[PDB]
Structure 1
Amino acid sequence: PQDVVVRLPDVAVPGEAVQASARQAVIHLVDIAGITSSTPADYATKNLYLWNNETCDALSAPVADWNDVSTTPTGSDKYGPYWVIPLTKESGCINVIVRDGTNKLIDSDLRVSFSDFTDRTVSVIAGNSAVYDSRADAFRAAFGVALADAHWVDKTTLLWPGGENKPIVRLYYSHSSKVAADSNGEFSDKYVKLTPTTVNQQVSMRFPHLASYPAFKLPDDVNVDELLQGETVAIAAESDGILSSATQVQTAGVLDDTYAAAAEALSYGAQLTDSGVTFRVWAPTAQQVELVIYSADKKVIASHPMTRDSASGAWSWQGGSDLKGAFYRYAMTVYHPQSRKVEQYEVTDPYAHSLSTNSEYSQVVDLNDSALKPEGWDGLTMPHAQKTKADLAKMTIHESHIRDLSAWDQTVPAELRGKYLALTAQESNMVQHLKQLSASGVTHIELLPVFDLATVNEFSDKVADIQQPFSRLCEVNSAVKSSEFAGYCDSGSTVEEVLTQLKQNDSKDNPQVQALNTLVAQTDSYNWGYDPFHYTVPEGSYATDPEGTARIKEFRTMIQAIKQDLGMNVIMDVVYNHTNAAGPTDRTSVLDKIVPWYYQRLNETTGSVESATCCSDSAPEHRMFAKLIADSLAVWTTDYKIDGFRFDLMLYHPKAQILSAWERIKALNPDIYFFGEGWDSNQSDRFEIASQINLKGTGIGTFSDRLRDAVRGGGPFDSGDALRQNQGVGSGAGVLPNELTTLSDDQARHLADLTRLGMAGNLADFVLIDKDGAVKRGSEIDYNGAPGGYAADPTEVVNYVSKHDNQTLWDMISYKAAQEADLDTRVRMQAVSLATVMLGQGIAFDQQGSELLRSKSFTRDSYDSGDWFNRVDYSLQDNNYNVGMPRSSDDGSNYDIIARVKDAVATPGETELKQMTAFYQELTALRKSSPLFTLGDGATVMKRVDFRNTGADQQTGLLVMTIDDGMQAGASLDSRVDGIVVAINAAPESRTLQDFAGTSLQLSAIQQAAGDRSLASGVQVAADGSVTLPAWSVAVLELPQGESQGAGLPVSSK
């Protein structure tokens, strides 16, 4: 009122000094600092460095002497200097650097492509590294709103670097337009002034990554709720009111400080009460929300302006009970900072609980209706207990996929192939194999994404699968008509048949199976599905009918068949760490359309949605997304009876967030198990991440990569010859070397430390003898510079040697096994590999089909490689090995080593698969054959679990583990044995154990029953108590328990 007027510099927008003529380019330097006059700031010291050579070669005679300053401006006007630059051809690009003497002003070897600016007349500006098409663009950028490095973090606090040490600091706002300069070049919209302040600790706690930011203070009476209705720009100016900078404002902090407290007390979605249906959606910044209501054929039949609750920021409307079954969306009117527009669009409900086909509309549903439950649903019990640490330890997971399970199975009814309902085909090969796996002690099926994914089109008409005519492929995929496979549109054979014919002439120089499959991938039904569209509705394409609630009942039918007929618990993979899209445009941007910039994690400076996850990084560190997650998990827990959840990329989540979620779900069902996967994150600066280290002692499990890398060999980044040289314990590291490896005995001995430690459950405090005979705690064994042991209890550790991502176990072994290793040796290598997991104290996890030697033709990342490369054949003809070179984009640089190694031995057939299945069932039956394998508690494991054959002079590749049921340990947990010995001999030599001489040790009953089909076939226990172990074998032995408890196998104090 008294205030200085903030404004542009009173000078017109500059035109162009010179346009370039033929064989010329022109470069303007827009001296912005000078144009707010005073000094004529001489331009003779200004100069260009121009050099050609690689990348850009269009200049005509570049002065390559770096010091030579002589290339000074051709002329100047009041807006600065400019340069006329001769060229060779005028189509191309040039390399330029801009300098004040040998000093320098644009921290970047900048470049001028003539393909963008075809008049070759561009402008730049001291500091910016951008290349503008005119001085006016540059000038406007210089004085226009840019980036979004202002953070309105609570009601009275704005963190912003742009305002540091500036007299005028203000928050401008326009409810309905962009904030911009006047007809008079002034900023006339309303504003609040910001007084410099010091940030506080409540906000330093909340935003540690922003704590070095200049803090600014808002009058205690600012009408916050009105500022968040529109656009909010932060602006800084000098004493004359001329603008220094202006940026957009990230508002997520102040939205939580303002509304989260009230909004967490509310329930969301379309909710059947007894008064009818209540709709509520959280839209704290929206200007309008209307509830549109749709007919069965998707016509508008009502549109209701909703009631905004001023405290929560949530919008609600109460309607009739006849809205049950109606399709609906929210018609939003809302400012989006990305587009700087008050957008208008219809968004489906992020709390949707049912959907129309391909998720176009959300649908009012009562999940409690018996109409959407299969008969007996409410009685469904957990076939396996999860209460105690010992209960959880017995967990043995089968990581599976809806289409992997049934797509190829001719014994599944055609219409159920690739569907939730394939699991009811009680006499299919797939289902009876799973029933057998369960019988032998697989306990858990883990489901790859069955929530609503984005990346399969649920309109069946727009989708062709390889089991269908190839002409169907051409109809729905127009790229096919314009490719080397066009001839097959009339062939009258299926895509499956065409792919089989392409095997014959397929090689590293004719990778044609992959070439056709790549196009199939775009329009088939196949995807892992790590692409969330709606978090709390079943995927529609796995239903026999994706329109409406059909999927809800079919899914639960599937859940029933796994728990009741199959006798297994059920785990869901869940992806709360990202969304499929953000912004106001994209079909699958849901959350970021309704409350823009609140649900995604943004770069502190630009405000861009980060993509470290792959995609649109979500922001689970914000309260209303934490609630969304917990409410979502609750529905899956209560309404779908899911027994546990695997968090994808769990370290992009705050530890406190996961724990808070777990407590909410423990409150509904105390035995639900939580675990997740995580290795990169790099979000440590924003909060304490949900990582392997930090989660110690919480009871949240994590995939361990330690044993995995030690038994598989190498790591996930390997390519080329490293895939072969990096043998593991499972593939003969240092005992049966191949022709390329260099692994020393020490390197091999270290892998074995990682593997014992993992078999004892990868505890930090478990004490063992290392490769050099030194005493070490699990934390003290090294895993690529990190402590190897990180857990408090073994139930915090999930062990595995194969998984959906990266190469399958069989393919790793094929990469790494010595040529002399024959097929049966490779089969036992698979079995010994898996024994380190199945006989270990950690939770046991494994890829569907390891019991069938599953291959993906060396495909490392098969998320989109279709029915073809992920084939699992429950008719036991082969293991899908050698069905073509894998996709070139991701595996092309491995074609050389593949062709070199691929044909060392024969492709596994029915005999080998059947042999492997028995090996597998033997191991899992052993895992549950005695409680000593699954002690549960970490203090119990240290007290009872020990190793032999340790130290520098160990027999390489021979793991000997003891479990004690004797007196030094406490109660006899097994009323049949006093102790157990697990001997895994991953070596070509036979080995003899003397540690148990004259002690009445004996082979386990399970292995003795399997005869010469046992992994222990050929093991002899002498009367003097020595044990002979055949090459490549796994033996489990027992101390028989007498009339009272014996002395067992006490752990030594090291």
Structure 2
Amino acid sequence: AFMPDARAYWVTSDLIAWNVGELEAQSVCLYASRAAAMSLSPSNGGIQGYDSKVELQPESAGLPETVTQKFPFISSYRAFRVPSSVDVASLVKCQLVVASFGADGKHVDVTGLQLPGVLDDMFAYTGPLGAVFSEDSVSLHLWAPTAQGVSVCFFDGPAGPALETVQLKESNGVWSVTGPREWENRYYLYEVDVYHPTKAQVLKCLAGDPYARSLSANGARTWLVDINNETLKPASWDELADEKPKLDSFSDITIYELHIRDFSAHDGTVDSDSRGGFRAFAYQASAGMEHLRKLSDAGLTHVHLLPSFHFAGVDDIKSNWKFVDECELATFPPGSDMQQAAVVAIQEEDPYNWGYNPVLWGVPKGSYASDPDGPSRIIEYRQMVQALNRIGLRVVMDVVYNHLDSSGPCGISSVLDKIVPGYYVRRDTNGQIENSAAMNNTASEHFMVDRLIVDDLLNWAVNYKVDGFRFDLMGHIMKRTMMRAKSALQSLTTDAHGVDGSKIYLYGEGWDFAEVARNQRGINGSQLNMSGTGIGSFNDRIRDAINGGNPFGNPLQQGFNTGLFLEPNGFYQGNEADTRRSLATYADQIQIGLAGNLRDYVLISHTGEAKKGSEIHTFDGLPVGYTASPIETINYVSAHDNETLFDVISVKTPMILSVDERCRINHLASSMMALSQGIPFFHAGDEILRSKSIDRDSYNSGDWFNKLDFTYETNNWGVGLPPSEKNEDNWPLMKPRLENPSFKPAKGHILAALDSFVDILKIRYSSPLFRLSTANDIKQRVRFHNTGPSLVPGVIVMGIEDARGESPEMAQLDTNFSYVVTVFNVCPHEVSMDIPALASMGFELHPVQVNSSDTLVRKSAYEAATGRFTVPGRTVSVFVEPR
């Protein structure tokens, strides 16, 4: 059910805002009902069922600055004063309406009130929430300022009946009770008597604790556990800070994005109880962990795990899970629609979901634990973090503070909106819930939401020693929330909290759209607003320029690395002159991205004109470069959302290409990330040609379409048409590709891709020149050599200078090399790039490539006489000048 009409706002203890006309409103009245008994029958004409009524006086000047700064979208609203003899604290517990009356008489308008403003003004609370343990006692605190009553129900274990109810007492919107230490390890729920607008009734609801630290299966009950308890800690837990991989600089970060279930779902070297969960990471002897160890040893610093907190959509009870038969599905044709039909038939009841469906942020996901009741979810999550740290990998959590799975009074999956209806969720100007994020958008602009987000971040940092956070839809989060979180986390110390907060890294998707766009709800965490914060955002410009098109465009639109102009695929994209100009535009966008996507980096563009990164624009008119630092740029070409790297290349390149050619194209795309300034971001599987059978949104597509094969025998290409819900419109382009045997790589291709990926990682970490930490360093040191109207199409040449000669004008960063030149050649044929500025130097092919298993790259050459660099087709060559 929709929330009722609520077009007025209660913004402070004394002020109500409502966009009503001057002559349209002679006077305005507020009506309250304790029992939610108000109605408006057209036969009677007047509001009935009210316990009280109070006239509001119009406030000529309007709303104070503190309101309009907080809620800018109502800055134009007329202001109405509530007399100070009105018991506001009692009234917010009631059903409320406001009514307008013409200066001639008779009701002209009636509406409900949106209460967050007044709830913050009067009841913002900074004290303890959830459970607090002392030597002799346990206390519980719940923020529920609109509730008429709150009790706690204690349970006989995770499945047993209620044993005891205890009433809580209210003070300033906060309900609390203190009990004996013996309450420890009980299970509980709050019983909350509250007016729910969606049902127009005061209902008695059972809710979990927003500040839960553990749960029974599916969050049915909250476990009253002391998170600091010694028995919940793996061996050596309190010494993990001493074991954490060194991180000299944020500019040294590389990120690998991985789904916890994908990691081990198909790993036969992992035991059956650990497969698909946290424990499979503590299995150091597996093919999966050996794979991560290999990447980590080559230089990978961070693993970004998909949502791992309490989300909806997967049953925590493993015995409820439904599976397909993989042996059967393997016999269906590669372009058949039967595999997806089988998956879709059980997708609501299978073990699989990305997890972008938040219920409680503070608790590990039960389905990823060996037992969803008791201590295992806590212990095993910690075991995972420890195990990753031990193989040289820091751990990033994908956090999803932008929306909730559910709202309203009904269901196991609604918590926040059950307790304080209408507060935690963002609403439009008619009172309906905003759904632009997916459904049930949160409102970080509200005090207690901001508090819950920051408190949750601190929970993961301190209680689980998490090393970083990726913020889903950061643009839906207020900038002030992001900045306070940054201040709070970065001030944690090993002595006082057990973790070095100064090393915690934050980044997010700064997409600016819908109701939050252009600062409508306040300064939000969009890409542009986050410039100069030290918080990273995904660089979509470099992604689209390399791959071609856009997630919202025609799938056949080519880019720099998918054959635009050079290798036309037959989908019409203009004449030769149009496609060549589009190629050169993408080349400029990529070069800005390679230099850290800085707003003030100056590039010679394809017109021959010198332009700042922010002066170069996208097709839709946005500045390409926007950051103040390379650490604010997350460069990527692939991720869990949209088609994998292998699949996008297979769609966009000409059908006539061999998989051998497409293998090198995959490598070029990952090398562009791996050798860029800023922070490279890799989708798990980039390195082994991972396919999802061209699934563009595999969130609910099961283990079948999301397979990671650490035997390296297959890449999951050609396993049927992907689920129709998200893919059907593109099936006609997918079928002939999936059925064509020359599109499928063999084991030798997959292993070659892996070997080359590891090599390019090693090159990144072979020289500090690839990882400059400031905009000044990049502006002084990084040059592009193939520019202007006469640029060679399909070639990028990037030079990086270090101190050389007697008394140089820069610090010496590299003890081994004095200059580095990278040539990205996406042309099918060999190129010869003459760079006279680099003649008479001691360039050699990088030792890693000299000793490469790839025969082609070993053919690369430099000629000192002319500064000529020769690079084979579809190759990235790195040349170094040894000291």
Fold-level similarity (TM above 0.5): yes
Q: Is the 8 A contact 2:737 2:743 kept in 1?
A: no
CA contact (8 A) 1:520 1:866 kept: no
- The answer to whether the aligner puts 1:830 opposite 2:666 as a matched pair is yes
Aligned match of 2:401 = 576
2:569·2:653 contact (CA, 8 Å) conserved in 1?
yes
Aligned to 2:151: 290
Aligned-partner Cα distance in 2 for 1:524–1:249: 42
Residues 257 and 1027 of structure 1, relative CA distance in 2, 3 Å threshold: same
Q: What's the CA shift for 1:969?
A: 5.1
2:877 to 1017, 1035, 1038: 1035
Number of residue equivalences? 850
In the alignment, which residue of structure 2 is the partner of 1:950?
Answer: 787
Q: Distance in 2 between matches of 1:268 and 1:163?
A: 43
* Distance in 2 between residues matched to 1:846 and 1:1014, nearest whole Å: 25
When residues 950 and 384 of structure 1 are mapped into structure 2, their CA distance, relative to the original with a 3 A threshold, is farther
Match of 1:338 in 2: 198
Change (3 A) 1:1013 1:219: same
Change beyond 3 A, Cα 1:396–1:553: same
Using the TM superposition, give the Cα deviation of residue 335 of structure 1 relative to its aligned residue in structure 2, in angstroms: 1.1
Aligned AA for 2:832? Answer: T
Partner of 1:303: 165
Change over 3 Å in CA distance of 1:184–1:957 after alignment to 2: closer
Letter in 1 for 2:601: F
Q: Which amino acid aligns with 1:773?
A: G
Instruction: In structure 2, give the amino acid aligned to 1:698.
Output: T
Runs of 5+ consecutive residues of structure 1 not aligned to the other structure: 1-144, 467-494, 1042-1054
Query: Does 2:849 match 1:1007?
Result: yes
Q: CA deviation at 1:212?
A: 1.2
Task: Give yes or no for the alignment of 1:988 onto 2:815.
Answer: no
Deviation at 1:241, TM superposition (A): 4.9
Aligned pairs for 1:737-752 (under 5 A) are 737-742=568-573, 744-752=579-587
Would the alpha carbon gap of residues 887 and 410 (structure 1) be closer, same or farther in structure 2, given more than 3 Å must change?
same
Give yes or no for the alignment of 1:793 onto 2:629: yes
Q: What do the CA deviations read for 1:627-667 (whole angstroms, capped 9, x no partner)?
A: 00111110100010000000001101111111112111122
| Per-residue Cα deviation, 1:356-392 (whole angstroms, up to 9, x for no partner) | 01110001111112211110011113644446xxx11
* 585-594 vs 956-965, greater mean Cα deviation: 585-594
Distance of 1:501 and 1:821 partners within structure 2? 27
Q: Summarize the alignment of residues 179-328 of structure 1 with structure 2, pairs less than 5 Å apart.
A: 179-180=38-39, 186-187=46-47, 189-197=51-59, 198-239=62-103, 241-260=105-124, 263-264=125-126, 266-296=127-157, 297-310=159-172, 313-328=173-188
- One-letter identity of the residue aligned with 2:541: R
The answer for the alignment partner of 2:377 in structure 1 is 551
**Aligned partners of 1:899 and 1:541: how far apart in 2?**
34
Q: Is the 8 A contact 1:355 1:549 kept in 2?
A: no
Is 1:730–2:730 an aligned residue pair? no
Q: Once the 2 structures are TM-superposed, how far is the Cα of residue 1009 of structure 1 from its aligned partner?
A: 2.1
- Deviation at residue 456 of structure 1 after TM alignment: 0.2
Task: State the Cα deviation string for residues 217-237 of structure 1 (Å, max 9, x = none).
Answer: 111332110111111110112
- 1:396-475 to 2 correspondences below 5 Å: 396-466=254-324
Task: Please give the per-residue CA displacement for 1:914-972, whole angstroms capped at 9, x wherever unaligned.
Answer: 00001100111111111111111111111111100111111111110111102565110
* Residue 230 (structure 2) aligned to one of 370, 382, 386: 370
- Does the alignment pair 1:520 with 2:380? no
| Preserved CA contact (<8 Å) 1:768 1:777 | yes
Task: Give 2:486's aligned residue.
Answer: 662
Alignment correspondent of 1:169: 28
Report the Cα distance in structure 2 between the residues aligned to 1:894 and 1:288, rounded to whole angstroms: 54
Q: How far apart are residue 589 of structure 1 and its match?
A: 1.2
- Distance, in Å, in 2 between the alignment partners of 1:592 and 1:1015 is 60
- 1:889 matches 2:730: no
Matched AA of 1:1018: K
Task: Give the CA deviation at 1:498.
Answer: 2.4
Instruction: Provide the residue aligned with 2:330 in structure 1.
Output: 500
Q: Structure 2 matches for 1:669-680, cutoff 5 A?
A: 669-680=501-512
Does the alignment pair 1:927 with 2:769? Answer: no
**Counterpart among 8, 11, 15 of residue 157 in structure 1:** 15
Select the residue among 773, 776, 794 that pairs with 2:611: 776
Asked whether the 8 Å contact 2:604–2:610 carries over to 1, the reply is yes
Cα distance in 2 for partners of 1:595, 1:363 equals 21
Contact between 1:357 and 1:548, CA under 8 Å: does it hold in 2? no
1:582, 1:609 within 8 Å by CA — same for their partners in 2? no
Partners of 1:206 and 1:430 in 2: CA distance: 48
Q: Which of 693, 703, 711 does residue 857 from structure 1 map onto?
A: 693
- C-alpha deviation, 1:162, in angstroms: 4.0
Higher relative contact order (Cα pairs below 8 Å, separated by 6+ residues): 2
- Alignment check: 8 A CA contact 1:168 1:241 kept: no
Matches of 2:770 and 2:677, distance apart in 1? 6
Shift of 1:762: 0.5
Which residue among 636, 647, 657 is the counterpart of 2:471? 647
- SS of equivalent residue, structure 1 residue 881: coil
> How big is the shift at 1:983?
1.0
Q: Offset at 1:1016?
A: 2.4
Summarize deviations over 1:455-479 as a string: whole Å, max 9, x none: 101122321123xxxxxxxxxxxxx
Aligned counterparts of 2:31 and 2:346: Cα–Cα separation in 1 = 52
The 8 Å contact of residues 194 and 217 in structure 1, kept in 2 or not, is answered as yes
State the distance in 1 between where 2:40 and 2:815 align.
85
- CA distance 1:897–1:733, change in 2 (3 Å): same
Check whether the contact 1:398–1:846 (CA below 8 A) recurs between aligned residues: yes
Distance in structure 2 (CA, Å) of the matches to 1:160 and 1:761: 47
Amino acid across the alignment from 1:978: S
The SS at the match of 1:1017 is: helix
**2:698 counterpart SS class:** coil
In structure 2, the partner of 1:810 is: 646
The one-letter code matched in structure 2 to 1:409 is D
Q: Once the 2 structures are TM-superposed, how far is the Cα of residue 1031 of structure 1 from its aligned partner?
A: 0.6
Which amino acid in the other structure matches residue 975 of structure 1?
Answer: T
**Which residue among 855, 863, 872 is the counterpart of 1:1022?**
863
The aligned amino acid for 2:452 is L
Across the aligned residues of Structure 1 and Structure 2, the Cα RMSD in angstroms comes to 1.7
Instruction: Spell out the pairing of 1:544-693 with structure 2 (5 A cutoff).
Output: 544-564=370-390, 566-605=391-430, 607-668=431-492, 669-682=501-514, 683=516, 684-693=519-528
Instruction: Report the Cα offset of residue 621 of structure 1.
Output: 0.7
Contact 2:826–2:874 (8 Å) recurs in 1: yes
SS in 2 for 1:235: strand
Per the alignment, residue 74 of structure 1 pairs with none
Bigger Rg, structure 1 or 2 = 1
Q: Tell me the residue number matched to 2:252.
A: 394
Query: The residue matched to 1:727 in structure 2 has which SS?
Result: coil
Residues 281, 315 of structure 1: 8 Å contact kept: yes
Alignment check: 8 A CA contact 2:137 2:178 kept: yes
The alpha-carbon deviation at position 186 of structure 1 amounts to: 4.6
Deviation at 1:353, TM superposition (A): 0.3
Paired AA for residue 201 in structure 1:
E
Take 1:969 and 1:758, find their aligned partners in 2: how far apart are those partners? 26
Please tell me whether the aligned partners of residues 824 and 875 of structure 2 are also in contact (alpha carbons under 8 angstroms).
Answer: yes
Higher mean alpha-carbon deviation, 654-663 vs 566-575, is at: 654-663
Measure, in 2, the Cα distance between the counterparts of 1:871 and 1:184: 64
Question: Are the equivalent residues in 2 in contact too, given 1:298–1:327 (CA < 8 A)?
Answer: no
Q: Secondary structure at the match of 2:784?
A: strand
Q: Counterparts of 1:164 and 1:294 in 2: how far apart (Å)?
A: 56
Give, as a single letter, the amino acid of the residue that structure 2 aligns with 1:317: V
